[PDB]
Amino acid sequence: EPRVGNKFRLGRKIGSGSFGEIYLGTNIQTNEEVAIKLENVKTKHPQLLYESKIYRILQGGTGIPNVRWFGVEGDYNVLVMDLLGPSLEDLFNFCSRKLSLKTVLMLADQMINRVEFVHSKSFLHRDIKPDNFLMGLGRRANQVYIIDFGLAKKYRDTSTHQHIPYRENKNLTGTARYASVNTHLGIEQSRRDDLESLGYVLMYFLRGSLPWQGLKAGTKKQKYEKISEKKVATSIEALCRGYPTEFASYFHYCRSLRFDDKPDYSYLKRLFRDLFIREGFQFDYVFDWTILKY
C-alpha cells in the first residue's frame, strides 16, 4: 500500500511533534519496524533535512539513534529512523511525576555523557527537556537516547575550535520551563546553557516540579516574562533546598562558566557518581519504572 522510497511501508500514527507527524513503518525486505517522520514541505520552520545531517555527524555516539532514510516525496520531507521507547516525560508520568534520587543519578550520568558527546562534535542541542530523551528498546532498554536536533546549532569551527562570537539581542527559543536564564535574557547560547537546562530537567524529576511552573498570565509572551523573572528570583539554595548539596554545586558550576568556556563534564559527573556511591545504591539498571513494571 503506502510506501516511502520503495523500501518502507507506513502505518499506525504513533504521535507527532513540532515538525509534524510520526508513523510506525516497516522495512519491506527485513520487516524491521522503524519510525517515519513526515514534515510538510511548506512549514515555516522545516527541520527534518537539517536533522538528517546532524544525525549523520553524530552517528555512532552512544544513545544517538540512526537515520535509515531521508528524502522529499510529494509534499513531505520524510525522515525514517530507529524506533525508540518511551520519553522521560512519559516515564515520569508513569512514575507519578516524582523520581527517586537513585533514578535521577543513573539518568544524570548518561545525560551528561550525551550532552558532552553532542558538544564534542561542535554542536549545541539548545532544547534540553525531558521529551527529548527516550529510552531504547529491548536490549537497550537501560540506555538513554537524545533526540530532536531541530534547534541545534554549531558553536565552534570543527577544525580550529574557534568558538562562535558573543551576541545579545536574540529572540527566545527554547522551551520556557527548561530554558537557561541567559536564554530568557536574549543572550547567545553556548555549552553552559545546555548544561543549565539539563540541571532544570534533573530538578524537575527530583522535586516533582520547578517553582516557575503553573505561573498565571494573560498571553504567552507575558507568561514567558513571568517565567524569566521567577527563575532570576529563585536562588540556587532555594531550588535545591532539602536535596543533596551536589545539585546546588551543579548549578554553581554552570553559573561559573563564561560564554566560551569548555565545561568540565568529568567534574559534574564525579559529583553525582560520588553521591551515588555514598548513598549505597547499586548501579543496576533498575529505574523507578523498571521496578514498577515488575
Is the CATH number 1.10.510.10 carried by domain 85-294?
Answer: yes
Mark the binding-site residues for ATP, compressed into ranges.
Answer: 37
Cα separation values, 47 from 242, 248, 249, Å? 41, 35, 35
Resolution of the coordinates, Å: 2.0
Instruction: Choose, from 82, 90, 109, 127, the residue flagged as catalytic.
Output: 127
Q: Write out the residue limits of the CATH 3.30.200.20 domain(s) in the chain.
A: 11-24+35-84
Confirm whether 260 is a catalytic residue. no
In sequence order, the 6+-apart residues with CB closer than 8 A to the CB of 39 are 19, 20, 46, 47, 48, 76, 77, 78, 79
With beta carbons less than 8 A apart as the criterion, state whether 154 and 146 touch: no
Is the CATH number 3.40.190.10 carried by domain 11-24+35-84?
Answer: no
Mark the binding-site residues, compressed into ranges.
Answer: 37
How was this structure obtained? X-ray
